[PDB]
Ligand binder design. Structure first.
Ligand SMILES: CC(=O)Nc1ccc2c(c1)ncn2C
Length: 154
């Protein structure tokens, strides 16, 4: 019982792009860009499509960096999140009704206003490490338990 999702981090040598989500799941938190994968669409194409829809940016090269499974106690579907990174983009980030993008210096990543699991795996993402993770949540603020390990192949 799992549903595919993508998450794209535009990570440049001194900064990362995050978007403040205005409504829906995760509203009020800074997130990477992503969403559900369509029928007949590859995960990578879904990731490129969501990055454009949510940030206005066109990604050139995308790299697989992780896989994170989210469980919400009482929710039947697990979120199978395929995480990607890019340093090569085109366009300028666009603020829309749905998302407010902002660049953050790497030492100023706003973890207090992000999903709690980000504090766990961002340190790996910042050091160019790949990972497999699983986070069990109670509501949207509490991590009941988790696993996170570094991998050679996502
Ligand atoms: C950076 C980012 O968007 N991370 C993120 C994105 C979505 C997440 C999550 C963490 N933890 C649970 N959900 C649903």
């Amino acid at each position: 019982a799992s549903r595919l999702y993508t998450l794209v981090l535009v990570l440049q040598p001194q900064r990362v792009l995050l978007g403040m989500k205005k409504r829906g799941f995760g509203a009020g938190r800074w997130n990477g860009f992503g969403g559900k994968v369509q029928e007949g669409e590859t995960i990578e194409d879904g990731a490129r499509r969501e990055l454009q829809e949510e940030s206005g940016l066109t990604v050139d090269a995308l790299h697989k960096v992780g896989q994170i499974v989210f469980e919400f106690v009482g929710e039947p579907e697990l979120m199978d999140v395929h995480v990607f990174c890019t340093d090569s983009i085109q366009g300028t980030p666009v603020e829309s009704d749905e998302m407010r993008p902002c660049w953050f210096q790497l030492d100023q990543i706003p973890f207090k206003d992000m999903w709690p699991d980000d504090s766990y795996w961002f340190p790996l993402l910042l050091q160019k490490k790949k990972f497999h993770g699983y986070f069990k949540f109670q509501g949207q603020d509490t991590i009941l338990d988790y696993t996170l390990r570094e991998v050679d192949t996502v």
